[PDB]
Amino acid sequence: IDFVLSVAGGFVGLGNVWRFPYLCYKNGGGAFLIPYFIFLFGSGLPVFFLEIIIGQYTSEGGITCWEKICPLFSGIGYASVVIVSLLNVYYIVILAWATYYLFQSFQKELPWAHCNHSWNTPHCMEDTMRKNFTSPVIEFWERNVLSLSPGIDHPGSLKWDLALCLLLVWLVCFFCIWKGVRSTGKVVYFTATFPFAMLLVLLVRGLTLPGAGAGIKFYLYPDITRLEDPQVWIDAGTQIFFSYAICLGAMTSLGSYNKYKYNSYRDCMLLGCLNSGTSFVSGFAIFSILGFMAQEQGVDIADVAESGPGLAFIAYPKAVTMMPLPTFWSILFFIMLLLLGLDSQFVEVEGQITSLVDLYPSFLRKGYRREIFIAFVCSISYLLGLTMVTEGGMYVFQLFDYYAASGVCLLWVAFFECFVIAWIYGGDNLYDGIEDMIGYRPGPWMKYSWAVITPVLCVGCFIFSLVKYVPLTYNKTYVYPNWAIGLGWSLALSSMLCVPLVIVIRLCQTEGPFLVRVKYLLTPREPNRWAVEREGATPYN
Ligand SMILES: N=C(N)NCCS(=O)(=O)O
Ligand SMILES: N=C(N)NCCS(=O)(=O)O
Ligand SMILES: [Cl-]
Secondary structure, rough: HHHHHHOOOHHHHHHHHHHHHHHHHHOOHHHHHHHHHHHHHHHHHHHEEEEEEOOOHOOOOOOOOHHHHHHHHHHHHHHHHHHHHHHHHHHHHHHHHHHHHHHHHHHOOOOOOOOOOOOOOOOOHHHHHHOOOOOOHHHHHHHHOOOOOOOOOOOOEOOOEHHHHHHHHHHHHHHHOOOOOOOOOOOOHHHHHHHHHHHHHHHHHHHHHHHHHHHHHHHOOOHHHHHOEEEEEEHHHHHHHHHHOOOOOOOHHHHOOOOOOOOOOHHHHHHHHHHHHHHHHHHHHHHHHHHHHHHHHHHHHHHOOOOOOOOOOHHHHHHHHHOHHHHHHHHHHHHHHHHHHHHHHHHHHHHHHHHHHHOOOHHHHHOOHEEEHHHHHHHHHHHHHHHHEOOOOHHHHHHHHOOOOOOHHHHHHHHHHHHHHHHHHHHHHHHHHHHHOOOOOOOOOHHHHHHHHHHHHHHHHHHHHHHHOOEEEEEEOEEOOOHHHHHHHHHHHHOOOOHHHHHHHHHHOOOOOOHHHHHHHHOOOOOOHHHHHHHOOOOOO
Protein backbone atom coordinates (compact mmCIF):
# COMPACT_ATOMS: atom_id res chain seq x y z
CA ILE A 1 0.00 0.00 0.00
CA ASP A 2 3.04 2.22 -0.64
CA PHE A 3 3.78 2.32 3.08
CA VAL A 4 7.51 2.72 2.41
CA LEU A 5 6.75 5.47 -0.11
CA SER A 6 4.62 7.34 2.44
CA VAL A 7 7.28 6.88 5.13
CA ALA A 8 9.95 8.01 2.64
CA GLY A 9 7.67 10.72 1.24
CA GLY A 10 10.13 13.30 2.53
CA PHE A 11 12.22 12.96 -0.63
CA VAL A 12 11.12 16.45 -1.71
CA GLY A 13 13.13 19.08 0.11
CA LEU A 14 14.73 22.48 -0.25
CA GLY A 15 17.00 21.08 -2.96
CA ASN A 16 13.96 20.49 -5.18
CA VAL A 17 12.03 23.68 -4.40
CA TRP A 18 14.84 26.19 -3.82
CA ARG A 19 18.23 25.07 -5.15
CA PHE A 20 17.13 23.42 -8.41
CA PRO A 21 15.24 26.41 -9.88
CA TYR A 22 18.01 28.85 -8.99
CA LEU A 23 20.71 26.61 -10.47
CA CYS A 24 18.63 26.11 -13.63
CA TYR A 25 17.94 29.84 -13.95
CA LYS A 26 21.62 30.67 -13.39
CA ASN A 27 22.77 28.24 -16.11
CA GLY A 28 20.47 29.65 -18.80
CA GLY A 29 17.48 27.37 -18.32
CA GLY A 30 16.98 24.56 -20.82
CA ALA A 31 20.69 23.83 -21.22
CA PHE A 32 20.78 22.87 -17.53
CA LEU A 33 18.44 19.91 -18.05
CA ILE A 34 20.65 17.89 -20.41
CA PRO A 35 23.53 17.36 -17.92
CA TYR A 36 20.89 16.98 -15.20
CA PHE A 37 19.35 13.97 -16.93
CA ILE A 38 22.73 12.63 -18.06
CA PHE A 39 23.89 12.55 -14.42
CA LEU A 40 20.47 11.34 -13.25
CA PHE A 41 20.59 8.00 -15.09
CA GLY A 42 24.37 7.63 -15.25
CA SER A 43 25.64 8.57 -11.82
CA GLY A 44 22.70 9.81 -9.74
CA LEU A 45 20.57 6.71 -9.30
CA PRO A 46 23.54 4.26 -9.38
CA VAL A 47 25.39 6.05 -6.56
CA PHE A 48 22.19 6.27 -4.49
CA PHE A 49 21.60 2.55 -4.97
CA LEU A 50 25.26 1.82 -4.21
CA GLU A 51 25.12 3.68 -0.90
CA ILE A 52 21.85 1.99 0.08
CA ILE A 53 23.28 -1.43 -0.84
CA ILE A 54 26.51 -0.83 1.09
CA GLY A 55 24.47 0.14 4.14
CA GLN A 56 22.11 -2.83 3.84
CA TYR A 57 24.95 -5.30 3.20
CA THR A 58 27.55 -4.18 5.75
CA SER A 59 24.83 -3.25 8.27
CA GLU A 60 27.04 -0.33 9.32
CA GLY A 61 26.94 3.45 9.28
CA GLY A 62 28.81 5.93 7.13
CA ILE A 63 32.34 5.08 8.25
CA THR A 64 32.23 1.49 9.50
CA CYS A 65 30.72 0.42 6.16
CA TRP A 66 33.90 1.55 4.39
CA GLU A 67 35.95 0.08 7.24
CA LYS A 68 34.40 -3.28 6.27
CA ILE A 69 34.27 -2.96 2.46
CA CYS A 70 37.80 -1.58 2.04
CA PRO A 71 39.80 -0.29 5.03
CA LEU A 72 42.41 1.58 2.97
CA PHE A 73 39.76 3.86 1.46
CA SER A 74 38.06 4.39 4.82
CA GLY A 75 38.68 8.15 4.74
CA ILE A 76 35.83 8.50 2.25
CA GLY A 77 33.47 8.18 5.20
CA TYR A 78 35.41 10.79 7.16
CA ALA A 79 35.19 13.12 4.17
CA SER A 80 31.41 12.70 4.14
CA VAL A 81 31.24 13.66 7.81
CA VAL A 82 33.19 16.85 7.13
CA ILE A 83 30.88 17.65 4.22
CA VAL A 84 27.75 17.23 6.31
CA SER A 85 29.20 19.52 8.98
CA LEU A 86 29.59 22.34 6.48
CA LEU A 87 26.10 21.60 5.18
CA ASN A 88 24.58 22.02 8.63
CA VAL A 89 26.30 25.40 8.87
CA TYR A 90 24.63 26.94 5.83
CA TYR A 91 21.63 24.79 4.89
CA ILE A 92 19.77 26.09 7.95
CA VAL A 93 20.37 29.74 7.03
CA ILE A 94 17.74 29.41 4.29
CA LEU A 95 15.24 28.40 6.97
CA ALA A 96 16.06 31.61 8.84
CA TRP A 97 15.19 33.56 5.70
CA ALA A 98 11.94 31.62 5.40
CA THR A 99 11.18 32.29 9.06
CA TYR A 100 11.75 36.00 8.47
CA TYR A 101 9.34 35.94 5.54
CA LEU A 102 6.87 34.07 7.73
CA PHE A 103 7.00 36.83 10.33
CA GLN A 104 6.47 39.30 7.49
CA SER A 105 3.30 37.52 6.37
CA PHE A 106 1.34 38.31 9.56
CA GLN A 107 0.01 41.66 8.36
CA LYS A 108 -2.81 43.05 6.26
CA GLU A 109 -0.63 43.86 3.23
CA LEU A 110 2.40 41.85 2.16
CA PRO A 111 5.47 44.13 2.36
CA TRP A 112 6.82 42.91 -1.01
CA ALA A 113 3.95 44.41 -3.02
CA HIS A 114 4.43 48.19 -3.17
CA CYS A 115 7.14 50.86 -3.20
CA ASN A 116 5.99 53.05 -0.29
CA HIS A 117 8.24 51.48 2.36
CA SER A 118 11.33 52.94 4.01
CA TRP A 119 13.73 50.42 2.48
CA ASN A 120 12.49 51.08 -1.06
CA THR A 121 14.86 53.10 -3.25
CA PRO A 122 13.55 55.89 -5.49
CA HIS A 123 14.14 53.43 -8.37
CA CYS A 124 11.22 51.27 -7.16
CA MET A 125 8.42 51.00 -9.74
CA GLU A 126 5.39 48.76 -9.29
CA ASP A 127 5.32 46.01 -11.90
CA THR A 128 1.73 46.90 -12.84
CA MET A 129 2.85 50.39 -13.90
CA ARG A 130 6.33 49.26 -14.99
CA LYS A 131 5.54 49.34 -18.71
CA ASN A 132 16.98 51.96 -13.61
CA PHE A 133 13.65 50.83 -12.19
CA THR A 134 13.66 47.98 -9.68
CA SER A 135 10.84 45.63 -8.69
CA PRO A 136 9.44 45.97 -5.15
CA VAL A 137 9.70 42.20 -4.69
CA ILE A 138 13.45 42.25 -5.42
CA GLU A 139 14.08 45.27 -3.18
CA PHE A 140 12.39 43.60 -0.21
CA TRP A 141 14.71 40.61 -0.68
CA GLU A 142 17.79 42.83 -0.97
CA ARG A 143 17.14 46.08 0.91
CA ASN A 144 15.07 44.59 3.76
CA VAL A 145 15.67 40.84 4.16
CA LEU A 146 19.36 40.82 3.25
CA SER A 147 20.42 44.47 3.56
CA LEU A 148 22.99 43.56 0.93
CA SER A 149 26.53 44.94 1.14
CA PRO A 150 28.80 46.04 -1.72
CA GLY A 151 30.86 42.88 -1.28
CA ILE A 152 32.03 40.04 0.92
CA ASP A 153 34.92 42.17 2.20
CA HIS A 154 32.29 44.55 3.62
CA PRO A 155 30.56 42.47 6.33
CA GLY A 156 28.69 45.53 7.62
CA SER A 157 26.85 44.77 10.85
CA LEU A 158 25.07 41.65 12.06
CA LYS A 159 21.37 41.61 11.22
CA TRP A 160 19.63 41.37 14.59
CA ASP A 161 16.35 40.26 12.99
CA LEU A 162 17.78 37.35 11.00
CA ALA A 163 20.08 36.41 13.90
CA LEU A 164 17.06 35.88 16.16
CA CYS A 165 15.32 33.91 13.40
CA LEU A 166 18.42 31.76 12.87
CA LEU A 167 18.63 31.04 16.61
CA LEU A 168 14.92 30.17 16.68
CA VAL A 169 15.38 27.47 14.04
CA TRP A 170 18.43 26.05 15.85
CA LEU A 171 16.46 25.86 19.10
CA VAL A 172 13.79 23.87 17.25
CA CYS A 173 16.47 21.60 15.78
CA PHE A 174 18.14 21.13 19.17
CA PHE A 175 14.86 20.39 20.95
CA CYS A 176 13.75 17.99 18.20
CA ILE A 177 17.07 16.13 18.47
CA TRP A 178 17.55 16.23 22.25
CA LYS A 179 14.08 14.70 22.71
CA GLY A 180 14.00 12.94 19.33
CA VAL A 181 10.47 13.65 18.11
CA ARG A 182 11.24 11.81 14.84
CA SER A 183 7.81 12.88 13.50
CA THR A 184 6.33 9.51 14.52
CA GLY A 185 2.56 9.12 14.31
CA LYS A 186 -0.27 10.27 12.05
CA VAL A 187 1.43 13.60 11.25
CA VAL A 188 3.30 11.75 8.49
CA TYR A 189 0.25 12.12 6.23
CA PHE A 190 0.20 15.90 6.71
CA THR A 191 3.96 16.49 6.50
CA ALA A 192 4.24 14.47 3.27
CA THR A 193 1.15 15.55 1.30
CA PHE A 194 0.96 19.25 2.23
CA PRO A 195 4.06 20.28 0.19
CA PHE A 196 2.59 18.62 -2.91
CA ALA A 197 -0.73 20.39 -2.30
CA MET A 198 1.00 23.78 -2.12
CA LEU A 199 3.24 23.03 -5.11
CA LEU A 200 0.09 22.11 -7.04
CA VAL A 201 -1.47 25.48 -6.18
CA LEU A 202 1.71 27.28 -7.25
CA LEU A 203 1.82 25.19 -10.43
CA VAL A 204 -1.80 25.98 -11.31
CA ARG A 205 -1.28 29.67 -10.51
CA GLY A 206 1.97 29.83 -12.48
CA LEU A 207 0.60 28.10 -15.57
CA THR A 208 -2.46 30.36 -15.82
CA LEU A 209 -0.50 33.61 -15.53
CA PRO A 210 -0.24 35.60 -18.79
CA GLY A 211 3.15 35.04 -20.37
CA ALA A 212 3.81 31.65 -18.77
CA GLY A 213 4.38 30.16 -22.22
CA ALA A 214 7.46 32.33 -22.73
CA GLY A 215 8.81 31.24 -19.35
CA ILE A 216 8.26 27.55 -20.04
CA LYS A 217 9.95 27.84 -23.44
CA PHE A 218 12.95 29.37 -21.67
CA TYR A 219 12.88 26.53 -19.14
CA LEU A 220 12.62 23.70 -21.69
CA TYR A 221 14.27 24.74 -24.96
CA PRO A 222 18.05 24.33 -24.48
CA ASP A 223 20.94 26.53 -25.54
CA ILE A 224 23.48 24.13 -27.04
CA THR A 225 26.34 26.66 -26.91
CA ARG A 226 25.85 26.84 -23.13
CA LEU A 227 26.91 23.19 -22.82
CA GLU A 228 30.49 24.13 -23.77
CA ASP A 229 30.78 25.86 -20.37
CA PRO A 230 32.05 23.27 -17.84
CA GLN A 231 30.14 24.91 -14.98
CA VAL A 232 26.82 23.73 -16.42
CA TRP A 233 27.86 20.09 -16.01
CA ILE A 234 29.24 20.57 -12.49
CA ASP A 235 26.13 22.48 -11.38
CA ALA A 236 23.71 19.96 -12.89
CA GLY A 237 25.61 16.85 -11.84
CA THR A 238 26.05 18.02 -8.26
CA GLN A 239 22.40 19.09 -8.04
CA ILE A 240 21.49 15.41 -8.42
CA PHE A 241 23.92 14.65 -5.59
CA PHE A 242 22.49 17.48 -3.46
CA SER A 243 18.84 16.46 -3.77
CA TYR A 244 19.62 12.75 -3.32
CA ALA A 245 21.66 13.45 -0.14
CA ILE A 246 24.38 11.07 -1.34
CA CYS A 247 28.12 11.27 -0.64
CA LEU A 248 27.15 12.18 2.94
CA GLY A 249 26.76 8.84 4.71
CA ALA A 250 23.06 9.55 5.26
CA MET A 251 21.86 6.98 2.73
CA THR A 252 24.42 4.41 3.90
CA SER A 253 23.20 4.95 7.46
CA LEU A 254 19.63 4.77 6.15
CA GLY A 255 20.49 1.60 4.24
CA SER A 256 21.77 -0.09 7.39
CA TYR A 257 18.24 0.10 8.82
CA ASN A 258 16.88 -2.13 6.03
CA LYS A 259 16.58 -5.87 6.52
CA TYR A 260 19.22 -7.95 4.77
CA LYS A 261 16.63 -9.72 2.59
CA TYR A 262 14.74 -6.66 1.38
CA ASN A 263 14.34 -5.50 -2.23
CA SER A 264 15.70 -1.97 -1.89
CA TYR A 265 16.30 -1.82 -5.65
CA ARG A 266 12.66 -0.95 -6.33
CA ASP A 267 12.67 1.67 -3.57
CA CYS A 268 15.75 3.52 -4.86
CA MET A 269 14.30 3.71 -8.38
CA LEU A 270 10.91 4.76 -7.01
CA LEU A 271 12.32 7.45 -4.71
CA GLY A 272 14.91 8.60 -7.25
CA CYS A 273 12.37 9.24 -10.00
CA LEU A 274 9.94 10.82 -7.54
CA ASN A 275 12.62 13.14 -6.14
CA SER A 276 13.90 14.18 -9.56
CA GLY A 277 10.37 14.28 -10.95
CA THR A 278 9.39 16.74 -8.23
CA SER A 279 12.23 19.08 -9.20
CA PHE A 280 11.33 19.00 -12.89
CA VAL A 281 7.61 19.55 -12.24
CA SER A 282 8.30 22.32 -9.71
CA GLY A 283 10.39 23.98 -12.41
CA PHE A 284 7.23 24.67 -14.41
CA ALA A 285 5.97 26.65 -11.41
CA ILE A 286 8.99 28.94 -10.98
CA PHE A 287 9.67 29.58 -14.66
CA SER A 288 6.02 30.26 -15.51
CA ILE A 289 6.10 32.95 -12.81
CA LEU A 290 9.38 34.29 -14.21
CA GLY A 291 7.84 34.40 -17.67
CA PHE A 292 4.95 36.46 -16.30
CA MET A 293 7.32 38.81 -14.46
CA ALA A 294 9.35 39.36 -17.64
CA GLN A 295 6.18 39.96 -19.66
CA GLU A 296 4.78 42.83 -17.58
CA GLN A 297 8.11 44.43 -16.65
CA GLY A 298 9.32 44.43 -20.26
CA VAL A 299 12.60 42.78 -19.29
CA ASP A 300 14.31 39.64 -20.55
CA ILE A 301 13.38 36.45 -18.71
CA ALA A 302 17.02 36.00 -17.65
CA ASP A 303 17.19 39.48 -16.07
CA VAL A 304 14.04 39.65 -13.92
CA ALA A 305 15.25 37.94 -10.73
CA GLU A 306 18.38 36.92 -8.84
CA SER A 307 20.62 34.38 -10.55
CA GLY A 308 22.04 33.34 -7.18
CA PRO A 309 20.24 31.96 -4.13
CA GLY A 310 16.93 33.64 -3.45
CA LEU A 311 15.16 33.00 -6.76
CA ALA A 312 12.54 31.13 -4.72
CA PHE A 313 12.30 34.26 -2.53
CA ILE A 314 11.61 36.57 -5.50
CA ALA A 315 9.41 34.35 -7.68
CA TYR A 316 7.22 32.44 -5.23
CA PRO A 317 6.49 35.47 -2.97
CA LYS A 318 5.34 37.36 -6.08
CA ALA A 319 3.03 34.56 -7.24
CA VAL A 320 1.34 34.77 -3.84
CA THR A 321 0.43 38.41 -4.47
CA MET A 322 -1.75 37.35 -7.43
CA MET A 323 -3.75 34.76 -5.46
CA PRO A 324 -6.92 35.73 -3.57
CA LEU A 325 -6.15 36.50 0.07
CA PRO A 326 -2.37 36.74 -0.49
CA THR A 327 -1.75 36.82 3.27
CA PHE A 328 -3.25 33.34 3.65
CA TRP A 329 -1.18 31.83 0.83
CA SER A 330 2.05 33.55 1.92
CA ILE A 331 1.78 31.96 5.37
CA LEU A 332 1.17 28.50 3.90
CA PHE A 333 4.07 28.71 1.44
CA PHE A 334 6.68 29.55 4.07
CA ILE A 335 5.20 26.98 6.44
CA MET A 336 5.81 24.46 3.65
CA LEU A 337 9.36 25.74 3.18
CA LEU A 338 9.97 25.48 6.93
CA LEU A 339 8.52 21.95 7.05
CA LEU A 340 10.63 20.79 4.10
CA GLY A 341 13.84 22.24 5.51
CA LEU A 342 13.35 21.24 9.14
CA ASP A 343 12.71 17.61 8.19
CA SER A 344 15.94 17.53 6.17
CA GLN A 345 17.89 19.42 8.84
CA PHE A 346 16.77 17.05 11.60
CA VAL A 347 18.04 14.01 9.70
CA GLU A 348 21.41 15.49 8.75
CA VAL A 349 22.28 17.09 12.10
CA GLU A 350 21.21 13.99 14.03
CA GLY A 351 23.13 11.91 11.50
CA GLN A 352 26.17 14.08 12.18
CA ILE A 353 25.82 13.43 15.92
CA THR A 354 25.55 9.67 15.35
CA SER A 355 28.75 9.54 13.29
CA LEU A 356 30.75 11.52 15.86
CA VAL A 357 29.34 9.61 18.86
CA ASP A 358 30.08 6.23 17.27
CA LEU A 359 33.68 7.34 16.71
CA TYR A 360 34.11 7.77 20.49
CA PRO A 361 31.52 5.50 22.14
CA SER A 362 33.38 5.43 25.47
CA PHE A 363 33.60 9.22 25.94
CA LEU A 364 30.68 10.89 24.15
CA ARG A 365 28.27 8.25 25.49
CA LYS A 366 29.29 7.69 29.13
CA GLY A 367 32.12 9.98 30.21
CA TYR A 368 30.81 13.07 28.40
CA ARG A 369 27.03 13.32 28.05
CA ARG A 370 25.63 12.97 24.54
CA GLU A 371 22.96 15.51 25.50
CA ILE A 372 25.64 18.16 26.08
CA PHE A 373 27.39 17.20 22.84
CA ILE A 374 24.22 17.96 20.87
CA ALA A 375 24.21 21.46 22.35
CA PHE A 376 27.92 21.87 21.54
CA VAL A 377 27.47 20.90 17.88
CA CYS A 378 24.45 23.19 17.46
CA SER A 379 26.17 26.08 19.27
CA ILE A 380 29.31 25.87 17.12
CA SER A 381 27.25 25.56 13.93
CA TYR A 382 25.10 28.53 14.96
CA LEU A 383 28.14 30.77 15.52
CA LEU A 384 29.62 29.84 12.14
CA GLY A 385 26.24 30.56 10.55
CA LEU A 386 26.30 34.13 11.87
CA THR A 387 28.80 34.95 9.11
CA MET A 388 25.94 34.54 6.60
CA VAL A 389 23.58 36.77 8.61
CA THR A 390 25.57 40.02 8.48
CA GLU A 391 24.81 42.54 5.75
CA GLY A 392 27.60 41.04 3.65
CA GLY A 393 26.69 37.48 4.62
CA MET A 394 24.84 36.74 1.39
CA TYR A 395 28.19 36.46 -0.39
CA VAL A 396 29.46 34.06 2.29
CA PHE A 397 26.36 31.92 1.75
CA GLN A 398 27.13 31.63 -1.96
CA LEU A 399 30.69 30.49 -1.21
CA PHE A 400 29.41 27.78 1.12
CA ASP A 401 26.66 26.80 -1.32
CA TYR A 402 29.07 26.63 -4.28
CA TYR A 403 32.08 24.94 -2.64
CA ALA A 404 30.99 23.27 0.60
CA ALA A 405 28.76 20.20 0.16
CA SER A 406 28.65 20.87 -3.59
CA GLY A 407 30.83 21.12 -6.66
CA VAL A 408 34.06 19.15 -6.89
CA CYS A 409 33.83 18.02 -3.26
CA LEU A 410 30.86 15.76 -4.04
CA LEU A 411 32.42 14.61 -7.31
CA TRP A 412 35.53 13.69 -5.32
CA VAL A 413 33.55 11.53 -2.89
CA ALA A 414 31.32 10.02 -5.60
CA PHE A 415 34.32 8.99 -7.71
CA PHE A 416 36.06 7.18 -4.85
CA GLU A 417 32.87 5.46 -3.70
CA CYS A 418 32.36 4.04 -7.20
CA PHE A 419 36.05 3.34 -7.83
CA VAL A 420 36.48 1.25 -4.68
CA ILE A 421 33.32 -0.78 -5.27
CA ALA A 422 33.74 -1.32 -9.02
CA TRP A 423 37.52 -1.67 -9.36
CA ILE A 424 38.76 -2.80 -5.91
CA TYR A 425 35.89 -4.58 -4.16
CA GLY A 426 34.50 -5.81 -7.48
CA GLY A 427 31.21 -5.19 -9.26
CA ASP A 428 30.59 -8.93 -9.63
CA ASN A 429 31.45 -9.51 -5.97
CA LEU A 430 28.87 -6.93 -4.92
CA TYR A 431 26.32 -8.29 -7.41
CA ASP A 432 26.58 -11.64 -5.64
CA GLY A 433 25.78 -9.81 -2.42
CA ILE A 434 22.95 -7.88 -4.08
CA GLU A 435 21.51 -11.11 -5.51
CA ASP A 436 21.10 -12.55 -2.02
CA MET A 437 19.55 -9.32 -0.71
CA ILE A 438 17.13 -8.21 -3.44
CA GLY A 439 16.54 -11.79 -4.61
CA TYR A 440 17.71 -11.46 -8.22
CA ARG A 441 20.68 -10.37 -10.28
CA PRO A 442 20.23 -6.74 -11.40
CA GLY A 443 20.99 -5.55 -14.92
CA PRO A 444 24.34 -4.29 -16.15
CA TRP A 445 23.23 -0.68 -15.61
CA MET A 446 24.64 -0.41 -12.08
CA LYS A 447 27.81 -2.34 -12.90
CA TYR A 448 28.69 -0.17 -15.90
CA SER A 449 27.78 3.07 -14.11
CA TRP A 450 30.02 2.38 -11.11
CA ALA A 451 32.89 1.19 -13.31
CA VAL A 452 32.81 3.51 -16.33
CA ILE A 453 30.02 6.08 -16.49
CA THR A 454 30.38 7.66 -13.04
CA PRO A 455 34.23 7.84 -12.97
CA VAL A 456 34.30 9.36 -16.47
CA LEU A 457 31.69 11.98 -15.58
CA CYS A 458 33.33 12.81 -12.24
CA VAL A 459 36.91 12.98 -13.52
CA GLY A 460 35.83 14.56 -16.81
CA CYS A 461 34.05 17.44 -15.09
CA PHE A 462 36.98 18.02 -12.73
CA ILE A 463 39.56 18.17 -15.54
CA PHE A 464 37.49 20.41 -17.82
CA SER A 465 36.55 22.78 -14.99
CA LEU A 466 40.23 23.35 -14.21
CA VAL A 467 41.17 23.71 -17.90
CA LYS A 468 38.37 26.25 -18.43
CA TYR A 469 38.22 27.96 -15.05
CA VAL A 470 35.55 30.63 -14.51
CA PRO A 471 35.73 32.16 -11.01
CA LEU A 472 32.58 32.13 -8.90
CA THR A 473 30.38 35.20 -9.29
CA TYR A 474 27.30 36.39 -7.42
CA ASN A 475 24.28 37.49 -9.48
CA LYS A 476 26.41 37.61 -12.65
CA THR A 477 27.98 40.92 -11.63
CA TYR A 478 29.90 40.64 -8.36
CA VAL A 479 33.45 39.26 -8.65
CA TYR A 480 34.80 37.53 -5.57
CA PRO A 481 38.25 38.51 -4.25
CA ASN A 482 41.13 36.07 -4.49
CA TRP A 483 41.08 35.27 -0.77
CA ALA A 484 37.34 34.57 -0.91
CA ILE A 485 37.94 32.07 -3.72
CA GLY A 486 40.87 30.66 -1.77
CA LEU A 487 38.64 30.44 1.30
CA GLY A 488 36.03 28.67 -0.81
CA TRP A 489 38.55 26.14 -2.09
CA SER A 490 39.61 25.46 1.51
CA LEU A 491 36.01 24.49 2.28
CA ALA A 492 36.12 21.97 -0.57
CA LEU A 493 39.63 20.75 0.25
CA SER A 494 38.75 20.29 3.94
CA SER A 495 36.88 17.09 3.03
CA MET A 496 38.66 16.26 -0.23
CA LEU A 497 41.94 15.87 1.67
CA CYS A 498 40.42 13.34 4.09
CA VAL A 499 40.54 10.53 1.50
CA PRO A 500 44.34 10.64 0.94
CA LEU A 501 45.23 11.59 4.52
CA VAL A 502 43.64 8.44 5.96
CA ILE A 503 45.45 6.38 3.31
CA VAL A 504 48.73 7.84 4.58
CA ILE A 505 47.68 7.27 8.20
CA ARG A 506 46.63 3.67 7.55
CA LEU A 507 49.91 2.82 5.83
CA CYS A 508 51.97 4.24 8.70
CA GLN A 509 50.03 2.28 11.34
CA THR A 510 50.39 -1.04 9.51
CA GLU A 511 53.73 -2.84 9.77
CA GLY A 512 55.73 -4.76 7.19
CA PRO A 513 56.76 -4.20 3.57
CA PHE A 514 54.92 -1.51 1.63
CA LEU A 515 53.36 -4.00 -0.80
CA VAL A 516 52.19 -6.18 2.10
CA ARG A 517 50.65 -3.15 3.81
CA VAL A 518 48.61 -2.14 0.75
CA LYS A 519 47.39 -5.67 0.06
CA TYR A 520 46.43 -6.14 3.72
CA LEU A 521 44.57 -2.81 3.84
CA LEU A 522 42.63 -3.59 0.64
CA THR A 523 41.20 -6.90 1.83
CA PRO A 524 37.61 -6.52 3.10
CA ARG A 525 37.04 -7.33 6.78
CA GLU A 526 34.00 -9.64 6.81
CA PRO A 527 31.61 -7.33 4.91
CA ASN A 528 28.52 -9.38 5.84
CA ARG A 529 29.53 -10.94 9.17
CA TRP A 530 26.39 -9.76 10.97
CA ALA A 531 24.14 -10.90 8.11
CA VAL A 532 25.03 -14.61 8.28
CA GLU A 533 24.55 -14.95 12.05
CA ARG A 534 21.85 -12.42 13.01
CA GLU A 535 19.86 -13.31 9.88
CA GLY A 536 20.04 -15.84 7.06
CA ALA A 537 22.84 -15.04 4.63
CA THR A 538 25.65 -16.53 2.55
CA PRO A 539 29.16 -15.56 3.72
CA TYR A 540 31.18 -13.35 1.39
CA ASN A 541 33.84 -15.08 -0.73
N1 LIG B 1 16.58 13.09 1.13
C1 LIG B 1 16.32 13.74 0.01
N2 LIG B 1 15.53 13.20 -0.90
N3 LIG B 1 16.87 14.93 -0.21
C2 LIG B 1 17.78 15.60 0.71
C3 LIG B 1 18.30 16.91 0.16
S1 LIG B 1 17.04 18.13 -0.07
O1 LIG B 1 16.12 17.59 -1.03
O2 LIG B 1 16.37 18.20 1.33
O3 LIG B 1 17.71 19.36 -0.35
N1 LIG C 1 20.89 19.39 2.45
C1 LIG C 1 20.68 18.09 2.34
N2 LIG C 1 19.69 17.53 3.01
N3 LIG C 1 21.46 17.36 1.56
C2 LIG C 1 22.60 17.87 0.82
C3 LIG C 1 23.35 16.77 0.10
S1 LIG C 1 24.98 17.26 -0.39
O1 LIG C 1 24.83 18.23 -1.44
O2 LIG C 1 25.68 17.65 0.80
O3 LIG C 1 25.57 15.95 -0.96
CL1 LIG D 1 16.89 18.03 -8.00
